[PDB]
């Protein structure tokens, strides 16, 4: 009952951020903290003095020890670094240093850093490094799960998405006497535009093990809710650029609208670059998808596992309906986009599944198949194919039928 026994459990319930732990530490929120209205556990901190959260710890849990083990976890979503000003600029984001001793989380260009400091000028730093010179990044502007553990007799460890990345001995450190407060605030950042998103902060008064960490990752992933590429909840009525996970240098296009045209994967993507700062594939390419309410959605705008939907496709600034005639030859049913008034009795009902998958069905509820792609001669056409469904029934791996939904996001910054 690992979150339940945490010594600090910050969560947004009804109308307030609160510490749910038995300690009920005090929270002070600055004027310029922003909470996402879709999910107010998602907290945005700007490079402003009033964009801060302070936690006043109960005296019982202030860290002051040579020997006590402790850990912290949280999720973070860090916008792409765009500017030379971001190089060589380590900035604190979670501060628990007082009198030059304690702990802190800081960031730098392509880095997440944990620092410990004793009362005898000793220091230890574990670091996660990620590149901005990468076609498609797992990390830039995407939610990722951080976990840091500390065993005073041996090592400090940093985990990303449940996996151990770095470790260093901390037996070079004597007494660590951390602050009575924890300050969530960008401290020392030279770039006025910088911000972070954070969520689900916890402290623990032991060293978490690998298993506990993986289980926290899985539990906090919200697996009944589909996610977009950035890790935010997938929504209805929101345009998405599509990325097929088996061929990430292509985007979705449509040769011609109507039943005699088809959807296909076209490449290459272009690139976006700032010399010495980033070099990535362009994400805002192709014919956008919009998820439309059909049988689900009666409570909010969020797309959930097993929701039945329609998919609209934007072609030259007009919406069309993804559909197919399942009567066509062969298992692989080539997808088209149809004028919405003219879709008739074509197969168009999509069952969303949480990576994201889409199972096409006819109007009687029979499966046409998962949406993927199939090579016909020299073209990768989008299809619905029951071959995928039958491989899943046999517990066999399937390639080509998993998708990313990429909305425009300011933390990506592409035009
Ligand atoms: Cl795949």
Numbering used by the authors: 872 to 1225, 1234 to 1294
Q: Could you pull the original sentences from the published paper?
A:
Clostridium botulinum neurotoxins (BoNTs) cause flaccid paralysis through inhibition of acetylcholine release from motor neurons; however, at tiny doses, this property is exploited for use as a therapeutic. Each member of the BoNT family of proteins consists of three distinct domains: a binding domain that targets neuronal cell membranes (HC), a translocation domain (HN) and a catalytic domain (LC).
Here, we present high‐resolution crystal structures of the binding domains of BoNT subtypes/A5 (HC/A5) and/A6 (HC/A6). These structures show that the core fold identified in other subtypes is maintained, but with subtle differences at the expected receptor‐binding sites.
